[PDB]
Design a protein around this ligand. Structure first.
Ligand SMILES: O=P(O)(O)OC[C@H]1O[C@](O)(CO)[C@@H](O)[C@@H]1O
Ligand SMILES: O=P(O)(O)OC[C@H]1O[C@](O)(CO)[C@@H](O)[C@@H]1O
Ligand SMILES: O=P(O)(O)OC[C@H]1O[C@](O)(CO)[C@@H](O)[C@@H]1O
Ligand SMILES: O=P(O)(O)OC[C@H]1O[C@](O)(CO)[C@@H](O)[C@@H]1O
Lengths: 315, 315, 315, 315
């Protein structure tokens, strides 16, 4: 057995050889993950979003390694007074999958880490949080399911760890997660069918046709939590979709707090992530809360999606 | 705080005043649930079906209160040698939601309890396990999610309990679960669209139309675990569907191990459960492994389903 | 692995064949033990006496199997209104070893169970709690140490169980605890030397002489918690002593809440328990809070003690 | 609530400002402590010495921060191949209190940390492990009792932390532990009376005299585990003694693995630690396994001991 902490030490070349700093960063994360886990595992015994947001924020600050944060909850960025010397910033979705807490369904936490652009010693600015996804130095998520797992990447593969309540530590369970060769599952909220772009509606029809030669019809799976659907699709192959519609002309997902970190993780696992036309990671952020259409998973599935959008324009 | 054990004592009138026996029955269940939980919570750190099956079987026998069992795993019934004096039989689905274990997604355990028809002192026979669902004296399930919960009924409401790892006990969290007045979520594997009965395909179209006056289009949610989708729908309202198709002419779900206990639970919560035409609980079992189409959840939703099947016959 | 609950079922002949009632009795105990354990295991993260007293009292009442209780904390007995139909009474020392909580040292819980003398339907009276120790139908203790263990007897041996946090259940670890053939450890508060009876002072000198032929000098061990010193001595052999002195002319230990249950346990393990002259279990209680000199452990050691008291009278 | 990890960060001035290295050091310790804790908490469900030794050894090496270790178990020192670049060495007593495991009594782990004398890049030698106790840069212990606690010092006070199973983290419970003004408890194995030095026998008599003006007679407490007796005495005041005798002419305790770290901790808490004549920390080690008489606790008590040895020479 090998712990997350030991693993970080062992992989000295990752994270630009700044091992000591990665350790501090993930230490903040796992602590926050442990705290949230405790409250969720006894939720039965909206409000949790705030709790998660507060605990993760306090933890990151206590490591004295982050200059400031950006939360899906927060309207403005949060500058850590006394941390001006820090050279890292973190964007996060404290509790992804709000509609699942009360129903004992999987929810998660997403984080994205960037190296600041503004001079050390100075307070960070939105400039530091509006960099394209391709500049992230680290990304990962925490899934709170039957078991609690932490998944992350620095650019050298995707590593997953499972929390062991018996020990109180995160243990390595898979060092190199990769999407299998082919996917046979699509994850989308099909109730929103009539409002999806014509290309997406076509892909859905594509997915339901009878073609044993290509594993069709695919299976449908949609938990309602980006983190949990992604995690399953990554292990078993599949694609997750959340296109634009009436309620969300530019999609529902946040480009910086959700799309970018998951996109970085998908790409590092040999998958693909796009807004249906361009690479998520190369999009230049316009605003902190910018939303974006999102399609991620096995490379061939996302491609089929882009093709259908191409051949059937106009939503 | 009140424990499951204390609650059982307090409700002396339920279970036909045989309090001492209910206690023993649920004691077997929660122990099995605790054992399985432990292995699942560290699954990361098919095979689990066997483990769950063995642990639940051994636990029920050790209470010396059950004459024998029937498992979705077992081909034949299991007679407990030395328990001929027992007057209860139990049918179970040890681990519902096989495809979810490896992906850290919710799975569950389902149990159904019947009073034997054959004379005590004698070994039980299939006759004891082929009684209609309306004869069950108890039914419930265990959901292994972010938290582990046990839900059951004896005919006087549906009671849910949440396991507290800190204490090592199940605690009452909701004494009277009821479906809310209206449902706005449907749970079905839409990838199997083309093979569903025409009436079901119509209902799906119904679900996706724009009619704010009736909360349409509904939201789509499908975890892939009967226990977890049911649980969510029960708390938030909704309907779960698994009709017949090519791969399963009579549906996929087992009538005795899955449909009946969930049907008993749905009805006790003010909901409805049918095979699309008749009441699940009144169906006279033909065989131990009989499968059946299944539609369960809010009463009005299941009715809409029955109506569409009525107006559009032939699958 | 076998649980406490399963073990009770398996031993149908013990407790006068009233299996169902023993189960309810120990269920109250283990629940109280689990609750206390939780608060103690995070004590760092006098007051606990009250907490323990309240939790055990509430638990016993909730099983609707006990007519009333007597606590070392309580001045008067506690009659359970609505439990007049109960035929059992319980005397207890909720938290034995007060001076150990703040120092992270072992403490315990002691319980004694009697069958009432007064007619059912009527409220219990001190008469029910003043019966000699030889009438107990059950006795045991819970030790909260590196691990939490429950030890008890009904008259057919001493059984010990260890709590498994991973499972949340008590598991059988030893079905027949017996003192080894010989003891080589004495447990007494030697700082109180000058005030001990002359016979006890002689025994202490005896214990420190050089006589390899009899394993002397013995080893000295004194944790400060009756439960923990007893438990160790029972497994490794030894004797525990708490004689009379200035601060306590009749000893410090309570005859009914401490001496009797431990005496019943010691005798069932092949050991001996006396006040230095007579058998603890045959003493006829004079008052609820009666104190008594107490010497318990390996039979030969207690005998040596009685002999020295005999040969050197006057304290 | 503040974690051990956060506390270390917050106290940047301690440990010679080498914060990052202290963090790695204690991370190895707490992990080993968590692993051992798990096996001990289910011991019921000699051998543990080896387990503890192996787990702590593997953990320290995995942090790639220690050049090598010295264990009370090991005959020779253990050089970490591939860690020649490390500048720290650690001496340890993996499982102090062997005779307590089987009896569910408190046991502990002791560690001592030194900065090497030999050039980096080179393999460490006994020279690095034979430095006087006054050169330690860190010392502490882990007590496995009703709760699991970690206590340590770098020269700026004694800090204690309690492990929270609910969270899986160590939390600060006391930042500045100090012996109270006066002690009233002595901890010694009195069964070995006749073989103790005359001065010690006199002190024991001193301890048992009647002198309310000085809190005499003192109370006697002796758990049999150096870690647990020390911990209690530190919180409540008291003195622990283990002098020389026949079985151990130079005492039983190891000078480097036991006496030095506890001596450093006692002094940092305002207490005193000596071999009955000189300061433990200033003794120049002669051999790796050198034993030494040891007296530690409240300053005035140890002084009384030194005085009696002075006035009554010859053991
Ligand atoms: O309820 P809907 O419209 O399917 O949206 C669910 C999605 O929204 C989120 O909760 C927010 O990102 C995701 O976790 C999830 O994929
Ligand atoms: O993979 P499919 O065809 O959607 O079937 C999933 C269903 O099968 C089961 O796993 C077996 O009953 C259910 O738990 C679940 O609802
Ligand atoms: O502090 P003293 O006088 O040794 O008394 C300790 C004894 O008192 C009790 O705390 C009360 O029974 C026992 O648990 C323990 O054996
Ligand atoms: O059994 P004895 O001779 O009292 O020795 C016990 C002492 O030995 C050790 O086990 C070894 O250091 C200490 O933990 C304890 O104080």
């Amino acid at each position: 057995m090998k712990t997350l902490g030991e693993f970080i030490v062992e992989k000295q070349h990752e994270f630009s050889h700044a091992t000591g700093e990665l350790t501090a960063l993930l230490s903040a994360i796992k602590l926050g993950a442990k705290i949230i886990h405790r409250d969720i595992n006894k939720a039965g015994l909206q409000k949790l979003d705030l709790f998660a947001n507060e605990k993760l924020k306090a933890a990151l600050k206590a490591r004295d390694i982050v200059a400031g944060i950006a939360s899906e909850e927060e309207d403005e960025i949060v500058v850590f007074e006394g941390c001006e010397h820090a050279k890292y910033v973190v964007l996060m979705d404290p509790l992804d999958g709000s509609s699942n807490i009360d129903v004992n369904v999987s929810v998660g936490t997403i984080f994205s880490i960037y190296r600041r652009v503004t001079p050390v010693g100075t307070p960070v600015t939105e400039e530091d949080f509006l960099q394209p996804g391709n500049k992230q130095v680290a990304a990962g998520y925490v899934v709170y399911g039957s078991s609690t797992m932490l998944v992350y990447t620095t650019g050298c593969g995707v590593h997953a760890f499972t929390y062991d309540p018996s020990l109180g530590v995160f243990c390595l369970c898979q060092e190199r997660m990769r999407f299998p060769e082919k996917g046979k599952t699509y994850s989308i909220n099909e109730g929103n069918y009539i409002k999806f772009p014509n290309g997406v509606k076509k892909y859905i029809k594509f997915c339901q046709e009878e073609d044993k030669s290509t594993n069709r019809p695919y299976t449908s799976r949609y938990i309602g939590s980006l983190v949990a659907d992604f995690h399953r699709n990554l292990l078993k192959g599949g694609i997750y979709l959340y296109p634009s519609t009436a309620s969300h002309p530019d999609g529902k997902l946040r480009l910086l707090y959700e799309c970018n970190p998951m996109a970085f993780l998908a790409e590092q696992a040999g998958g693909k992530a796009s807004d249906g036309k361009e690479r998520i990671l190369d999009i230049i952020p316009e605003t902190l809360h910018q939303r974006r259409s999102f399609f991620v998973g096995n490379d061939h599935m996302v491609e089929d999606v882009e093709r259908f959008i191409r051949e059937f324009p106009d939503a």
